[PDB]
Amino acid sequence: ACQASQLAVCASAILSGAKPSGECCGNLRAQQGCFCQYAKDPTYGQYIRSPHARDTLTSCGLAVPHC
Numbered sequence: 411a412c413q414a415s416q417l418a419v420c421a422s423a424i425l426s427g428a429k430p431s432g433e434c435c436g437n438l439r440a441q442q443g444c445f446c447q448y449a450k451d452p453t454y455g456q457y458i459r460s461p462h463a464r465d466t467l468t469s470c471g472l473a474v475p476h477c
């Protein structure tokens with residue numbers, strides 16, 4: 411139901427770009443709902459369309475948006 415918090419911890423990488431993290435790719439899983447549809451969300455388009463974002467999720471290889 412869109413937590414908007416389980417991913418915040420990752421935002422550090424998406425926005426700033428400190429360093430990825432495994433927990434990140436895991437947090438989204440707990441969602442597997444809004445996270446998927448979020449792919450359409452324009453306001454957060456900068457988050458999903460990030461450079462390190464796709465890398466983090468891909469590194470895990472669990473679920474990719476655009477579903």
Ligand SMILES: CCCCCCCCCCCCCCCC(=O)OC[C@H](O)COP(=O)([O-])OC[C@@H](O)CO
Nearest residue numbers: 414417418445448454457458459463464467474475
């Ligand atoms: C409160 C702030 C937090 C923000 C909310 C976060 C919401 C979670 C969504 C995160 C999603 C990030 C993943 C990046 C999505 C993306 O841009 O897609 C890249 C994708 O991996 C590329 O697909 P592709 O390889 O071109 O697909 C074609 C291929 O399948 C066939 O060859």
